[PDB]
Write a protein that binds this ligand. Structure first.
Ligand SMILES: *C/C=C1/C(=C/c2[nH]c(/C=C3[NH+]=C(/C=C4\NC(=O)C(C=C)=C4C)C(C)=C\3CCC(=O)O)c(CCC(=O)O)c2C)NC(=O)[C@H]1C
Ligand SMILES: *C/C=C1/C(=C/c2[nH]c(/C=C3[NH+]=C(/C=C4\NC(=O)C(C=C)=C4C)C(C)=C\3CCC(=O)O)c(CCC(=O)O)c2C)NC(=O)[C@H]1C
Lengths: 313, 315
């Protein structure tokens, strides 16, 4: 099963109970964005991140009464149609708001049962993606495909280190390709145990395909209330990319000397084949539109891995 | 019966009838569609060899001036990028794309690929979260039918085409329309089937390697290359990788007879085989700009993946 989260007086996490940390319900988010939850029917704002006032420019109480209808007039019917009751928690809808306080915000919404989860992040506003797609497809074998993928991602993102991390049948991981800035250690060829990416995180990574830590020294921002009014239970944040990263996992990034980290799931035959895994030495908020490019690349790599593995077997 | 290609018309080959369908060398027509321009150049020196006859009007230069310069001089910023992206021996399927600001012609999209020692350069005029939203909707579709319907509707919304069909191949290479989105008033093609020589054998092979092709105006005359043969080889210039390549006159008559002014299609490739086609019709001529066509190319790949996934959920 899982332990209760901390804020419901559950046990603190060790290297003895790695598998039972409830990574999906931390009750908090990373501070480079803001999150609201809301009722599926009424559009009634039920929870907000204590930092919402910053991003939205709204007097705190104003929000926690109001309706999405009021708050987001153009958007609220689109949401209603895009995310019908009963849809999967994996389905997401995005829009760009030109919002008074903040030039442009990206809005990302998904639905978990009766709750809409809304994420707001700063945003903005060429051929590198098309060029990359063809490059991946003409790679002659899996090894070269891995090399092209890591190089392409590094060029698109500027990340200090991009790796392709492949899982063995026992969930033992191996860095099979790597693109990195001059003057970093080389993780190429190294294997790491299966507990370094524990079972409950690999399951989540099979369904929700992109996650990040923007700053491995930043404090999480609580949800208020912490419990969902609807249920008097924890809000599932598994499908939110603003969800706080497990402190057990940020301690392992800090000990490695990484200040920023992103990964994309490569999913083949319904299973987690491997990860595009990115490091930055310093804090780094990759903007939403560039993340989208990596999300596309994730799908394309999933296709090409199968194609390429089929021409060996 | 499968038989080798006839020589093209310009090398004294025969004219194409319903008898010799499968033998038209559709990859070497010696000509392009008039909404863009094409140059060929030597892959090592960058000497310009062939150009479409309309090139002066896209590029704003006399032929003899174009042909008298190397790509190093014509494309000083792109020439080194081309050479890195398209190394000798690379496959003909690999494409490099850039946007140019050309004085006379505005923003041009440049698409380049390499066939042996030849570079092929295509120039076309070029111009929010719809793709991301579509990607997730496709993935959440519960079964093959719902996927097919979401895919057709999405493509129609992105493009404005009068008709978008998912056209699936059977094992005998007959095809059937299994989903479609269509303009009000058009008759349905849903569930109709069509014989295997409707898209014959030398076109299905080409459609497994080069995944997008189009006919922007089913009545437009093709524009010859000049000279027609590659001076490197005194042989035909391979154009199967060029979206500008003229369409078969037999295929253009087939669309005209259906009342179609513009046709486009994307290949859906599963396990190395052509599974189907995203097929679009418009009743009037219609040019879809290169950046919009890129969205369809990306959806072609997504759909190939999702078709595998939906079919595996099915035994
Ligand atoms: C007590 C459990 C431990 C643990 C937990 C844990 N790990 C993740 C996610 C990841 N761990 C990774 C480990 C590595 N990073 C590397 O660079 C290498 C090798 C070169 C390894 C082996 C990776 C890559 C991930 C994926 C996420 C990412 O890329 O940022 C989680 C889930 C965290 C979350 O969802 O927020 C958890 C709970 N990690 C351990 O090492 C042990 C001590
Ligand atoms: C003897 C010659 C024949 C012939 C040749 C031919 N056909 C193609 C390509 C296509 N034919 C298609 C036929 C259909 N269009 C539809 O709308 C339906 C059903 C609803 C069918 C069955 C299609 C869809 C294509 C693909 C191109 C496109 O999407 O428009 C070629 C190759 C063209 C080229 O590469 O330039 C050739 C040579 N087809 C015949 O029926 C006979 C007359």
């Amino acid at each position: 099963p899982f332990f209760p989260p901390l804020y419901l007086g559950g046990p603190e996490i060790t290297t003895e109970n790695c598998e039972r940390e409830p990574i999906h319900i931390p009750g908090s988010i990373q501070p480079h964005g803001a999150l609201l939850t809301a009722d599926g029917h009424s559009g009634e704002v039920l929870q907000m991140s204590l930092n919402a006032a910053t991003f939205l420019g709204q007097e705190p109480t104003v929000l926690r009464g109001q309706t999405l209808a009021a708050l987001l007039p153009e958007q609220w019917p689109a949401l209603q149609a895009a995310l019908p009751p009963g849809c999967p928690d994996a389905l997401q809808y995005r829009a760009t708001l030109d919002w008074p306080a903040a030039g442009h915000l990206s809005l990302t919404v998904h639905r978990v049962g009766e709750l809409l989860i809304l994420e707001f992040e700063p945003t903005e506003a060429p051929h590198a993606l098309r060029n990359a797609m063809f490059a991946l497809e003409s790679a002659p074998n899996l090894r070269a495909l891995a090399e092209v993928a890591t190089q392409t991602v590094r060029e698109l993102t500027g990340f200090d280190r991009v790796m392709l991390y492949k899982f063995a049948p026992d969930a033992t991981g191996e860095v099979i390709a790597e693109a990195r800035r001059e003057g970093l250690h080389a993780f190429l060829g190294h294997r790491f145990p299966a507990s370094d990416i524990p079972a409950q995180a690999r399951a989540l990574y099979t369904r929700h395909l992109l996650r990040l830590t923007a700053d491995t020294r930043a404090a999480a921002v609580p949800l208020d209330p912490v419990l969902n009014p609807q249920t008097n239970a924890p809000t599932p944040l598994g499908g939110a990319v603003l969800r706080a990263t497990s402190p057990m996992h940020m301690q392992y990034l800090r000990n490695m000397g990484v200040g920023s980290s992103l990964s994309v799931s490569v999913v083949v035959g319904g299973q987690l084949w491997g990860l595009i895994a990115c490091h930055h030495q310093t804090p780094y908020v990759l903007p939403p539109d560039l993340r989208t490019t990596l999300e596309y690349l994730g799908r394309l790599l999933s296709l090409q891995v199968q194609v390429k593995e089929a021409l060996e077997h």
